[PDB]
């Protein structure tokens, strides 16, 4: 996996070039927003259980056929499977967010996921309803606009970070 | 690419864990030491050609026998590649200073290097000569700040220690 700096270095390398001055100033911007980024990550991981059962309960909320016989959240074993998968995806997008790169999300989690699901019978339109709910639960927590819980941070615009985390959730909703 | 962020994330991934305090502190350290390795990195990137050229001249000064027929400097094309290799290494040091870890050096130039040089008759000592020269040549505060000297000197010692 790569992070923000390794990603700049891989791109510089494809041209056999030392790191541009433009790229250095981008990276020092990355560094300037270091602490906002850490607060972003902290606001997701401190609420991970909330985010994952919100999203799965919601998925089932909008389509109760999932928990009728033959649906993929039917037994306790499949419900627990789905909760684990929600948790796993959220973990790899919190890696992405802390990394500044989607490298690890794509490499260690999304690669072959679409196939695995096709094989198992896991409804993909539903996985992405869950992931899209997690997207909003998460950008709420980042932006500190979640209804039932706040997290004291200093006053600033965290919108670039929220958009980042939403772009990683969309990478997931697209891998399948 | 080995680095604070990658090392920490993949420790946590190995464990099934979300990031926690250790992980966030680790990145915070990346923030603190950022500003002097990027200084080294920019000074190196801004003067790479003169550094590469003094280092290669120092190498062939120490080992004039390399210019003999049969040695790795018996032709102008071969000597020029020698300085090219030195530049590759300094580019990778640039990367290493920007990432914050020895990743780029590790994968892109250390990995095959003993086999490759064993096979094309490139004495390990000549590169060590060129990096030692560069290291000792650096001057504080002329060439860069003290804690950037530390970072630069450090990557050079790492690459030196990979040829011993």
């Amino acid at each position: 996996m790569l992070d923000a700096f390794s990603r700049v270095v891989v791109n510089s390398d494809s041209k056999a070039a030392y790191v541009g001055g433009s790229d250095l100033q981008a990276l020092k911007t990355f560094i300037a927003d270091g602490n906002k980024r850490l607060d972003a990550v902290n606001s997701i991981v401190s609420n991970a259980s909330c985010i994952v059962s919100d999203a799965v309960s919601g998925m089932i909320c909008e389509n109760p056929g999932l928990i009728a016989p033959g649906g993929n959240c039917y037994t306790n074993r499949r419900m627990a499977a789905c909760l684990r998968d929600g948790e796993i995806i959220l973990r790899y997008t919190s890696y992405a967010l802390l990394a500044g790169d989607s490298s690890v999300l794509e490499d260690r989690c999304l690669n072959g996921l679409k196939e695995t699901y096709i094989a198992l019978g896991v409804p993909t339109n539903s996985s992405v309803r869950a992931v899209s709910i997690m997207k909003s639960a998460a950008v709420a927590f980042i932006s500190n606009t979640a209804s039932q819980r706040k997290m004291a941070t200093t006053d600033g615009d965290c919108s670039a970070l929220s958009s980042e985390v939403a772009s990683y959730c969309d990478k997931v909703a697209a891998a399948i | 690419m080995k680095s604070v962020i990658t090392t920490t994330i993949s420790a946590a991934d190995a464990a099934g864990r979300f990031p926690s305090s250790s992980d966030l502190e680790s990145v915070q350290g990346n923030i603190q030491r950022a500003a002097s390795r990027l200084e080294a990195a920019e000074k190196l990137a801004g003067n790479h050609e003169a550094v590469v050229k003094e280092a290669g001249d120092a190498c062939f000064a120490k080992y004039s026998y390399l210019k003999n027929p049969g040695e790795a400097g018996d032709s102008q094309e071969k000597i020029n590649k020698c300085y090219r290799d030195i530049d590759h290494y300094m580019r990778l040091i640039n990367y290493s200073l920007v990432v914050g870890g020895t990743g780029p050096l590790d994968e892109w130039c250390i990995a095959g290097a003993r086999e490759v040089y064993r096979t094309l008759n490139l004495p390990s000592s000549s590169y060590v000569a060129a990096f030692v020269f560069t290291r000792d040549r650096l001057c504080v505060p002329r060439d860069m700040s003290a804690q950037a000297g530390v970072e630069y000197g450090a990557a050079l010692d790492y690459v030196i220690n990979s040829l011993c």
Epitope: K15, A16, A17 | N47, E49, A50, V52, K53, G56, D57, Q76, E77, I79, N80, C82, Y83, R84, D87
Partner: T-cell receptor
Framework: TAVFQTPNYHVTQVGNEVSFNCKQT?????MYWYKQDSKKLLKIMFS???????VNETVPRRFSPQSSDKAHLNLRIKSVEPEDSAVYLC???????????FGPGTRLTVLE | QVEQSPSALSLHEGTSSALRCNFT?????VQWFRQNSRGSLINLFY???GTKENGRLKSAFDSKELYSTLHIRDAQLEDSGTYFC???????????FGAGTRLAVSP
Amino acid sequence: TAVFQTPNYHVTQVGNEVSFNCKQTLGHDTMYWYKQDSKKLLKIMFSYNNKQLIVNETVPRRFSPQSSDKAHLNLRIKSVEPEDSAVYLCASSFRWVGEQYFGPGTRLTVLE
Amino acid sequence: QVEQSPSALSLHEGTSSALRCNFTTTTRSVQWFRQNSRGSLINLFYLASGTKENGRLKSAFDSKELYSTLHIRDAQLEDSGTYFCAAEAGSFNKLTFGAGTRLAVSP
């Protein structure tokens, strides 16, 4: 062997577009464009290692140089202007150690 | 930058003379050319802090003193031309040329 450069001379009118070509049959990997003023003074304009431009000495936007091979370097000037009349010298060398080898040049007069 | 003297030189067949070239920053090497009438730059020397001899020409380069000279011995008529020193001084990425020395031998 030598640095070969065409055309030797060229007259055009302000606003036309010109293009000089330089090749080198030496074993080399770096090529340059120099501009010799009328006071017999050479200044470097461009340098190229492999395909990658490595020196660009604040030439105006009209001057644009295209390399295909490491033994080839061309320069096209568009919207040619009157103060661009001079001798354009192509050189060639190894990047890291070696002397520069020059070619015959291209005198360009730009007439009102 | 790079100051080359004398600007012009009118020598008799047989006379010997010198051209000097002074630099302001540290120089890695020096190249001496002579430009013929058709305008090609003929390479005379490329040296790094030494002496080199070539026929009737002799060049020297003192890197710590930042100077380089070209000596012409027993000047022949084929030696007329414009003579240039280029220094790899500065950041060792480009050649800087001097103003030239216009040298003309009369028989």
